[PDB]
Symmetry: C4
Subunit: 328 residues, 4 copies
């Protein structure tokens, strides 16, 4: 007899059920509480990846009503500088910045708080690690009002641990990333739809929102992640290759590409075995057109489910479980 | 814990069980009640699509014992004209015409009723939308005897809503269309076999028939949709590319093709994000040969299940659930 | 709610469980009762197909300890002649011959019985059809000692019907054939492993053996069909393309091929829509080498399961159910 | 009704659950008890295959903290010589050697014990065969202290049989090998994750460790096999093509390859039908780099699950069951 805790579902395992609706897709309210104090106009966070979010992308997404997360794969001074560029920009834009859970990050957090960061992201592949929880407790004691997102977890016990450590928001995702090889390398992972619903159920009545991070391929996946209980989603692949993302555009056969790699790739690493792949992603153009298309998809879902707000989608919308023949 | 209402099955998930039979495939009765007043000789409806049904196809299918649905992607006057061409044609052929649920369709319904339409199709991607139900209630009050089909729904609550609004027949199908991207864009959908059986169970004892719309690839799918409880099926892909369908025949490498696109495709649309693809379908030839082949398949099923009539197939025939290995 | 009788399994859904064994693969007894009076040395029957069994193949398989079934796609006189060639051949070989269930087959049965046929196969795509059962009852009354195999069925009720009609053996298989399109055309079919076990359970205590017909791709499938309860298997694809099979060998790119088609293919038919495909199968060489390889596989299974006889394999060997990941 | 003992899971069916952790991947203890008297530094055994383990590979793996198994596809004198080369080498390296269960192996066991073998592997495709169990009982009586591994089994009854016969360790694996065709040829097999957990549950409280043999493709599979209860894993494919493995390196299109075949392949055999394939595997380079990468994967798992030792991973780590959509 094997120690199987439960069956766990991914995005492709389920579909949302259409319901009675007075909701017009164009009248749908996409605003969401990222934390008890931070409200975003769209439920979109950009990944803290060296091929996804630097100041230029963080600015564009904030303009669309989301929030960007400056990656930790640069010097403390260079990151605080990226935070200042987003913060100093006209329009009163909000920004986030990622920090490691390792020793010698107290200095980085200090520089980011001074640079005006709205939300500190304690960025770990294992949020339930005691060293991540200690770092959170240390940051919360020093900065009692700082908005902190901690992750990543994929269990109810993991979400509770982060909430007890002082997290303002909990990030969910162990193995779902499009560039992730954690599942194959370590054998560990939790299918995202179950991971999100478990974390949300654990955090019921706490006012601590859940972020569904990784595995979002289509706008239907955004809707599913929210109906599973996530207040917002974090995307890497969806925003990689856009004009606003870091790095230069490459020309291969005549088609335009941009780099996209996991933060656990050999390339991004330069002592652990890699948990991410390095690849090319087709050039997507301007972030504005991508967000318009993806949010439109979500809007159309809200019309089909009769959910006029993110909160209604999170708590009212129902799913049906489908087979492999259902999927194809 | 996720809000999973139930498991939902598609055509590939099931197979019909052979049973004791005195039914010869050639003696099988294919007639069905589309509504309490309209009886078709074959259980086949053509899709209200701009690449499937105009007067020429509607005439050919009516001649085979089915019914065509003139699409709403043309002016009010041009549609009433298409209705008159089918109606005025010799042989006393029946015709249907699709109308949108939006404002400024009262004028279209008036012109179609005057042009002699036998069945008005209130054509929506979301039949459970309050604005669709209101339009149905408005049409039923003005025309107490007009045959109205409303859709699309995929739940028991959705079928009941349409029946209460005054529908003569309920159309089922949320996401099963061969050209549909609703499932990927919105994340909403119900596998067709479950959607049909739920709607039929809801409408038991009402005399309001269910139309299984979308996803029919083979004649076996027609049989499955009927045994799931549908009185008839609606097909797009199956009749696209036929000589009688609208548009011109294209030559690519030496092979003959015709256009086939969703009514929610960018092309068909010209404010929502697209929910349909634009594609080429191989030229199928004359509609008569397709119907003979597809109905022959259904006839052979009726012989194997011991169901001599559509009503027997709808209520007696049993299924077995199969795995993915069952499918392949 | 859908009328789902049960879940049904195919060969790929299961695996046999290894067990304590005193059985050496080389000492395994492959003999089986085809009927209460006919005992075969190997549990192998060749398909009654115009691309599989004529006198030459029927002779070779009988020599290996199996039995061939001369197909009904030839004149009454020409079939009786094929029966005489196998019967008159030295060695006291047993032969079978297939007859249709249609009117004007009384003459064919008379000629086959006179020609010395050991087993009459009443060959139908639907054994549960009243016209098949009547034909069996008519043959049993006229020939009280004639060995009759009737089929095909795939249910417990279907197996009982054939046994009550007077069948000496029941043939199982609705939709499993490698060249079969019945499932796609009609939507009817029962996954073979469940179909066989249902028929065997129905016929428990009757002494009427079950033949698993269709879908056997590998020697492991033979073992699975027998452990599901079949006393023997019927193969088409496995023996198609052999030197002994009818038709000439074709040369395509340099590789040798032979024709293999369903008896319900357009080609084999020349009033029903086709339920079979027409294809080329690679030349397999001599039947002797194929049987040695396939029976060796079965022998090895008998060693792994601790089943020294066909009867032990049929009644003792256990299965495990596997997922799609189990299969690949 | 089919004799289905249970549902059985393979590596791809499950994922390990992340948990609270004070474990740093670099501080993780990989040591394991292969037997009550033999402790390995890494839980890795090399396959007793003629394309995987001879003295050179056995030396390299022992140096990494594992143990190699010299294959039985060579003369008694030539195998004892291979055992002496590993044993006589500097560093006090441990070695294993495989023997068949057939008659005329008493001579081979005598020569291997004299040559200084640390662990005798009674190597069979069917550990539950009475002739394998007798050979074990004969060896245990003659050598009361000799470390004996017997296999392969895949059931609780099979593991108990080997433990009762006197085995120091039980090897599990019926059909999971990357080069195995037993499942297709015989129809027998047990998905590895269930096979391992069943054998471990059977052997609870006996101090007799289980070896998970076959099917390990990635480092995540090692972790899964251990959490299923295996004390160690046996790998063929993972070490085939390495510089230390037997045979010469071949050049095909410009890429370097090495031979990899099942011990039941036609080639390795030269009276049974083959149960293995013959193939080329890409040249992997030095064994040291492969082990560093694979153990790193395991180390990372130990950090994610909060299991600081092999024993903790074997008994504390939990799984989630995933769908086919979960897998892809
Ligand atoms: C190589 C890998 N790289 C990454 C980097 C970013 C990631 N971001 C998200 C996820 C989600 O599965 C995994 C990630 C893996 C990684 O950090 N492994 C890893 C494995 C086990 C432990 Cl205990 C730790 N402790 C927390 C430092 C790290
Ligand atoms: C773009 C799309 N296009 C279509 C067009 C024809 C269709 N026909 C059938 C189906 C069935 O899923 C979907 C279809 C989508 C479409 O209408 N989306 C859509 C999504 C949500 C709502 Cl609330 C509405 N309200 C009813 C106007 C429309
Ligand atoms: C076209 C087809 N052809 C065949 C021919 C050989 C077959 N042999 C076996 C099987 C097993 O599914 C199907 C076969 C279909 C065929 O006979 N259909 C078919 C379908 C329904 C009925 Cl009621 C009948 N009645 C018995 C004459 C025949
Ligand atoms: C041809 C085959 N070859 C091998 C060789 C190595 C293997 N090693 C492991 C496994 C695990 O399924 C299968 C293997 C098959 C093989 O031994 N078959 C086989 C089948 C049934 C029995 Cl009763 C026996 N008795 C034990 C001698 C052998
Ligand atoms: O190398 C890596 N391994 C595993 N997960 C990663 C890696 N790098 C980033 N991630 C995660 O993958 C997410 C992006 O997933 P995507 O949106 O599916 O591409 C990020 O937000 C991280 O949570
Ligand atoms: O763009 C679209 N999106 C979704 N469904 C569509 C679209 N256009 C038409 N449909 C549906 O798809 C059906 C045709 O499906 P088919 O027979 O599987 O090709 C139509 O009768 C409509 O119900
Ligand atoms: O056209 C056909 N349709 C369906 N089944 C067929 C047809 N012709 C033969 N069969 C069946 O298929 C079996 C051969 O299956 P195979 O061994 O999997 O190739 C025959 O013994 C018949 O029972
Ligand atoms: O021909 C064969 N048939 C079946 N299993 C085999 C054969 N040769 C070796 N094996 C098994 O396959 C294992 C290697 O599996 P791998 O690590 O998945 O490649 C060996 O340790 C044996 O247990």
């Amino acid at each position: 007899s094997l120690r199987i805790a439960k069956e766990a579902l991914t995005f492709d395992d389920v579909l949302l059920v259409p319901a009675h609706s007075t909701v017009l897709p164009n009248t749908a309210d996409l605003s969401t509480q990222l934390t008890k104090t931070i409200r975003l106009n769209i439920p979109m966070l950009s990944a803290a990846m060296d091929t996804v979010t630097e100041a230029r992308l963080a600015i564009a997404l904030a303009q669309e009503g989301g929030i960007g997360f400056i990656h930790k794969n640069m010097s403390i001074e260079r990151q605080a500088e990226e935070v200042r560029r987003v913060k100093k920009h006209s329009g009163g834009l909000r920004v986030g910045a990622a920090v490691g859970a390792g020793a010698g990050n107290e200095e980085r957090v200090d520089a980011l708080v001074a640079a005006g960061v709205d939300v500190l992201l304690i960025d770990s592949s294992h949020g339930h690690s005691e060293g991540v929880l200690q770092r959170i407790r240390e940051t919360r004691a020093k900065y009692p009002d700082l908005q902190i997102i901690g992750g990543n977890v994929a269990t109810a016990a993991g979400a509770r641990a982060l909430a007890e450590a002082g997290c303002s928001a909990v990030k969910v995702g162990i193995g779902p990333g499009s560039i992730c090889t954690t599942r194959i390398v370590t054998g560990v992972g939790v299918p995202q739809i179950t991971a999100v619903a478990d974390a949300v159920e654990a955090l019921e009545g706490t006012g601590i929102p859940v972020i569904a991070d990784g595995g979002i391929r289509f706008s239907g996946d955004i809707a599913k992640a929210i109906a599973a209980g996530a207040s917002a989603v974090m995307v890497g692949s969806m925003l990689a290759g856009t004009e606003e993302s870091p790095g230069e555009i490459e020309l291969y056969q005549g088609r335009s590409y941009k780099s996209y790699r996991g933060m656990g790739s050999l390339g991004a690493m330069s002592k652990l075995v890699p948990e991410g792949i390095e690849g090319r992603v087709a050039y997507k153009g301007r972030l504005k057109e991508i967000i318009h298309q993806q949010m439109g998809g979500l809007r159309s879902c809200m019309g089909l489910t009769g959910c006029g707000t993110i909160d209604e989608l999170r708590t009212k919308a129902e799913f049906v479980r489908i087979s492999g023949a259902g999927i194809q």
